[PDB]
Write a protein that binds this ligand. Structure first.
Ligand SMILES: Cc1cc2nc3c(=O)[nH]c(=O)nc-3n(C[C@H](O)[C@H](O)[C@H](O)COP(=O)(O)OP(=O)(O)OC[C@H]3O[C@@H](n4cnc5c(N)ncnc54)[C@H](O)[C@@H]3O)c2cc1C
Ligand SMILES: Cc1nc2c(=O)[nH]c(=O)nc-2n(C[C@H](O)[C@H](O)[C@H](O)CO)c1C
Ligand code: SF4
Ligand SMILES: [Cl-]
Ligand code: NA
Ligand code: NA
Ligand code: NA
Ligand code: NA
Ligand code: NA
Ligand code: NA
Length: 516
């Protein structure tokens, strides 16, 4: 018989600056819980379970130190309840609450579950997470349903609205909006010798792993005794500072680069802030502001391309995919424009493929819970696009295996940008590529069993023929765009014999897809 108000904090709601905490109330109880149900909607990476569980406990500790009343329920405690609604209802009854409040969730499934909660004698309210730049209530106007809103136009509007990288008279700093064309370098040997050591934390996780195991919770991937990912706001801020000082000067330059050689190949110059942002340990405003401040203080050593390249991903892509998700869900999750139905190959779960590119991206995903963007898009994403993998199966892999994956951001990037299964709603054109793209941006083909210079026959890079088979299959859909039509000239110039050898090689590789 003890609290008037119960307030839930979900595992991705770790915003230390939330207005709830701006006052101290002895009549308010905060609840944060490890939840079996949140392990059952997809099979998560063990490192993702460890990171969220560690971060939820660390946030509870922060709140308690600040004088808030907080109960953190680990799986041993939460297993007494049937699901999250039962946990809420029983605890509200236990403490004789008059009111229950929660922060709006960031997946459709959970927003719907909480919206349908009814508690006898208890008033329920839903508040914002106080994190994203675009207010949730503006999504319907900014993102009309089933409309292919152009990310670039939304990004320019966001640049003007928030003032980031804008001139005093309202123009983009540097004479253009988007510096992506300057951000397409491959790492050469001297660049590899200069790669910085990624900032890795030492967060022990043996007890968390043992608790997960005791509850027979399924997971994918691997972890040792220590988790390298930030699990509290101080570690996240330290990663942000590391990024600004050590990585931001080359972030754009090598944004699309991949290497099989260097020990730090899994991180390169990326920020690795996505988990910290998506769990709301950091806000996008503070990350943007920190990186712009570092740029301005570097007196030319951080070029504008680096910081615009970074800001575009947070102010532009991240806010954009959120808007498109909420405007188009739940129908969006049914879209399969290209009719893709192939099973995801088994080496997505173990890395046992002879394609060096796929082997590197899958193995790092399994071993780190993380792949950088060009791997997600142009290595595993392109492969799943060209081989027509079932989007439901692809979504389950991406949403589970990456520590930063929550559906609002996974689904538009995977089903939309990578698989083109929304017919271009999210990103306009398919991101299809042959092995020539991988060879241009990476050193993978120099350490591969296949020959990237061969399109057909024995030992040819499978991407080379799978690319043409895909583009020819969809020629009528895609030839209306004029720039891609050029690609069909490269094809139409080939002999009948060569065209046929390529399509025959593609079909053979698909029939043997488990062996690639
Ligand atoms: C198929 C596919 C699936 C993806 N699934 C996810 C996912 O589940 N969660 C996720 O956060 N990102 C996802 N991304 C986007 C992007 O690849 C990751 O944000 C990025 O790899 C995270 O690494 P980082 O923090 O080092 O990013 P950096 O390269 O340092 O980029 C800076 C920040 O920009 C943001 N960002 C970059 N690209 C995007 C994007 N396309 N959409 C949204 N935010 C972006 C993130 O906040 C990131 O921390 C996906 C991309 C693809 C192509
Ligand atoms: C692995 C995981 N575990 C939990 C948990 O046990 N409890 C919790 O409150 N949240 C967890 N999360 C985050 C949620 O599954 C879900 O993705 C977000 O709350 C959506 O906004 C995740 C991702
Ligand atoms: S040759 Fe083809 S399969 Fe091998 S690394 Fe290059 S792109 Fe990947
Ligand atoms: Cl070189
Ligand atoms: Na359940
Ligand atoms: Na306390
Ligand atoms: Na070279
Ligand atoms: Na991106
Ligand atoms: Na779903
Ligand atoms: Na685009």
């Amino acid at each position: 018989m003890r609290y008037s108000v119960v307030r839930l904090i979900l595992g991705d709601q770790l915003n230390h600056a939330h207005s709830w905490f701006s006052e101290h109330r002895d009549d308010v109880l905060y609840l944060i819980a490890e939840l079996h149900q949140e392990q059952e909607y997809v099979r998560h990476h063990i490192q993702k379970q460890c990171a969220f569980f560690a971060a939820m406990q660390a946030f509870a500790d922060y709140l308690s130190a600040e004088g808030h009343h907080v109960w953190h329920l680990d799986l041993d405690a939460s297993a007494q309840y049937n699901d999250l609604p039962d946990l809420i209802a029983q605890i509200c009854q236990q403490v004789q609450a008059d009111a229950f409040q929660y922060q709006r969730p960031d997946e459709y499934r959970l927003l719907e579950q909480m919206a349908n909660l009814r508690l006898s004698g208890i008033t329920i309210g839903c508040v914002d997470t106080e994190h994203f730049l675009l207010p949730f209530a503006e999504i319907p106007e900014q993102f009309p349903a089933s409309k292919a809103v152009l990310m670039e136009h939304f990004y320019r509007r966001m640049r003007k609205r928030f003032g980031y990288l804008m001139t005093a008279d309202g123009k983009p700093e540097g004479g253009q909006w988007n510096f992506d064309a300057d951000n397409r370098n491959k790492l050469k040997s001297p660049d590899l010798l200069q790669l910085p050591t990624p900032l890795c934390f030492d967060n022990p996780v043996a007890s968390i792993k043992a608790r997960i195991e005791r509850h027979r919770i399924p997971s994918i991937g691997q972890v040792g005794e220590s988790l390298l990912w930030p699990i509290n706001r101080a570690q996240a801020l330290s990663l942000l500072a590391h990024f600004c000082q050590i990585c931001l000067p080359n972030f754009g330059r090598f944004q699309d680069a991949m290497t099989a050689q260097h020990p730090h190949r899994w991180s390169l110059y990326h920020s690795r802030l996505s988990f910290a942002l998506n769990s709301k340990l950091l806000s996008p405003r503070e990350v943007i502001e920190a990186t712009i401040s570092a740029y301005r203080a570097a007196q030319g050593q951080i070029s504008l391309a680096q910081v615009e390249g970074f800001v575009r991903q947070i102010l532009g892509w991240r806010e954009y995919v959120r808007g498109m998700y909420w405007s188009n869900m739940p129908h969006y999750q049914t879209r399969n424009h290209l009719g893709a139905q192939r099973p995801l190959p088994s080496y997505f779960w173990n890395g046992q493929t002879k394609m060096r590119c796929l082997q590197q991206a899958i193995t790092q995903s399994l071993d780190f819970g993380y792949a950088h963007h060009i791997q997600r898009l142009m290595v595993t994403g392109n492969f799943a696009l060209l081989t027509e993998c079932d989007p439901d199966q692809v979504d389950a892999w991406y949403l589970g295996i990456y520590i930063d994956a929550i559906e609002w951001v996974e689904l538009p990037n995977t089903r939309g940008m990578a698989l083109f299964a929304d017919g271009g709603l999210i990103a306009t054109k398919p991101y299809s590529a042959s092995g020539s793209y991988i060879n241009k941006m990476s050193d993978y083909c120099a350490s591969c069993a296949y020959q990237v210079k061969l399109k057909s026959g024995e030992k040819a890079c499978p991407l080379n023929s799978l690319y043409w088979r895909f583009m020819l299959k969809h020629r009528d859909r895609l030839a209306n765009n004029p720039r891609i039509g050029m690609l069909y000239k490269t094809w139409d110039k080939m002999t009948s014999d060569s065209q046929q050898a390529i399509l025959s090689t593609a079909d053979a590789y698909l029939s043997q897809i488990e062996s690639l």
